[PDB]
Amino acid sequence: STTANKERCLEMVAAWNRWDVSGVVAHWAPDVVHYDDEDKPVSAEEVVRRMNSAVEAFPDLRLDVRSIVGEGDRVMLRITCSATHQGVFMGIAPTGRKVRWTYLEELRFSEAGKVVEHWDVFNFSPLFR
Amino acid sequence: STTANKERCLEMVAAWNRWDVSGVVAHWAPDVVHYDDEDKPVSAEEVVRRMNSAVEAFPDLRLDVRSIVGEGDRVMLRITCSATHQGVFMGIAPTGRKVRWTYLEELRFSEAGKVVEHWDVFNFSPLF
Numbered sequence: 692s693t694t695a696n697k698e699r700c701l702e703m704v705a706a707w708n709r710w711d712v713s714g715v716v717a718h719w720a721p722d723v724v725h726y727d728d729e730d731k732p733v734s735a736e737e738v739v740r741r742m743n744s745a746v747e748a749f750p751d752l753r754l755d756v757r758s759i760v761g762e763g764d765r766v767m768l769r770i771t772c773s774a775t776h777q778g779v780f781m782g783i784a785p786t787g788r789k790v791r792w793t794y795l796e797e798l799r800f801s802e803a804g805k806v807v808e809h810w811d812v813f814n815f816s817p818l819f820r
Numbered sequence: 821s822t823t824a825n826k827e828r829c830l831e832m833v834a835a836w837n838r839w840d841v842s843g844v845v846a847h848w849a850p851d852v853v854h855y856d857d858e859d860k861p862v863s864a865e866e867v868v869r870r871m872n873s874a875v876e877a878f879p880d881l882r883l884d885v886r887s888i889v890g891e892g893d894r895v896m897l898r899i900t901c902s903a904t905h906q907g908v909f910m911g912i913a914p915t916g917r918k919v920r921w922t923y924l925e926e927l928r929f930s931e932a933g934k935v936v937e938h939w940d941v942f943n944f945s946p947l948f
């Protein structure tokens with residue numbers, strides 16, 4: 692089941708790598724809660740919007756899972772994303788340049804294998820250095 | 821093995837929470853490698869310098885472990901740090917304000933229970 696949860700996460704990475712946000716969302720429970728950097732909930736709709744913007748802005752993006760660990764109902768992954776910055780993202784004008792950042796994704800799964808809680812830690816300084 | 825590794829991580833957290841860098845370093849293997857944000861190794865000496873700078877900078881810091889997961893020889897923690905900016909930091913002079921940041925800490929352990937590889941992801945955005 693931790694094994695099953697890890698596979699689901701890899702499925703979500705694969706969905707990202709073919710630029711299919713809908714493929715990521717499909718793993719969400721209907722009552723999923725996403726948390727921002729201050730630990731405030733963010734609506735699933737705003738989450739989908741940020742994700743859609745990333746795929747538009749970083750249309751060649753590639754995610755490499757550097758590490759993944761599962762225990763109980765939890766999975767954590769450290770991921771590196773590489774892309775070229777082609778579109779506007781979170782107000783930042785494209786530079787046309789290669790960018791690369793590393794982050795954590797933490798996912799909590801229900802007994803049925805759907806994502807019920809979701810956290811991230813991003814170091815986005817390559818975008819605003 | 822995962823249980824013992826997680827317990828070691830929490831001892832390292834408790835060392836930080838009493839502002840004792842030595843207590844953290846005590847868990848390292850003799851040939852530990854620490855990777856920076858660009859995955860470049862950082863020398864022991866420089867890592868310890870950064871750790872000391874942080875305690876000088878934020879001498880009232882508190883680490884709150886939000887989540888900890890172990891499997892095999894690795895452990896990941898999602899940690900929230902709260903402090904007051906009382907010392908110079910990464911060149912920024914003190915402001916005296918309450919600050920807060922979140923980070924991932926990932927540690928890989930030897931069979932003997934020492935840290936052999938270590939990564940972080942810091943979100944310093946709130947702090948900046």
Ligand SMILES: COC(=O)[C@@H]1c2cc3c(c(O)c2[C@@H](O[C@@H]2O[C@@H](C)[C@H](O)[C@@](C)(O)[C@H]2OC)C[C@]1(C)O)C(=O)c1c(O)ccc(O)c1C3=O
Pocket residue numbers: 703704707715725726727728733738741742745746752754772781796809811813
């Ligand atoms: C490829 O993009 C990213 O690098 C970001 C990112 C990545 C993921 C997920 C993300 O939401 C995001 C994104 O993160 C959101 O948008 C950023 C602007 C916010 O600062 C954010 C980090 O708080 C987050 O908003 C909820 C952005 C980016 C660049 O697309 C994600 O939700 C996710 C998931 O729900 C389940 C499995 C996953 O592997 C992910 C993600 O990898």
